[PDB]
């Protein structure tokens with residue numbers, strides 16, 4: 001019975017159980033947590049009041065690295081430590097709080113980013129900006145009958161086709177201000193990106209949350225094709241480890257996670273699992289790939 005422990009869900013902690021199950025599938029994050037909490041074990045072991053210690057022992061039990069006799073784990077201690085200081089924003093909350101505790105080495109999700117904005121009517125380039133990312137949040141383009149949506153299409157749109165109209169072109173504005181007759185062209189800007197350092201744990205986020213004209217939240221259920229292997233050479237090799245899937249609508253939905261089985265070491269298992277909080281069942285790669293991914297966790301091979 002090669003299964004992972006489950007997680008209790010009293011009613012509204014799916015967004016965390018789904019993320020935790022996925023984070024336990026990235027062995028380098030867990031290894032970085034161990035070497036980070038080594039500082040607290042210098043004197044005695046510090047069994048407490050620390051977020052990294054609470055997260056590590058959860059991920060170590062979920063990845064079957066620590067012997068667990070309870071067939072279900074309870075992660076409520078992680079939520080209480082967060083409150084004293086959407087599964088995607090929780091990911092950004094956890095990574096930020098771990099960085100504040102470290103303020104050592106950067107967590108394997110940390111990447112570097114170089115960005116530039118170019119006007120679509122005169123090709124004027126904005127000043128180059130330097131950024132960091134812990135995840136690549138991608139837009140989902142428009143669908144079409146007989147035209148399937150792929151993750152690569154989303155990655156190309158994210159790199160050189162992302163539109164932004166929070167800015168205006170200085171060249172087109174000076175020109176339009178002339179003694180003649182000049183028509184105002186629609187301000188269209190594209191944000192051309194180029195990734196610098198690729199992190200060894202890659203998180204890809206598909207933006208499924210939209211907003212109507214009256215402020216009501218909308219969900220895009222369109223399927224995005226992805227594979228267990230993802231090459232990032234065209235944007236400069238990653239293996240899919242887990243997938244966070246959101247079912248239902250924005251109001252009465254539910255978070256679930258597909259994840260790989262824990263290794264029998266360093267060799268990634270081909271056995272996928274379906275984890276809905278406390279329920280853990282075996283699954284096939286065909287089921288994983290047929291789902292509408294919300295968060296994709298990869299690892300550099």
Ligand SMILES: *C(=N)N1CC[C@@H](CNC(=O)c2nnc(-c3cccc(C#N)c3)o2)C1
Pocket residue numbers: 009011012013014015086087208209219246248249250251252253254255294
């Ligand atoms: C888990 N145990 N529960 C309780 C009932 C549901 C209610 N909450 C949601 O359905 C929910 N909350 N946030 C989102 C969300 C945000 C952004 C993007 C997506 C997607 N795809 C979903 O859904 C949760």
Ligand SMILES: [Zn+2]
Pocket residue numbers: 119120121122123124169170171172
């Ligand atoms: Zn321009």
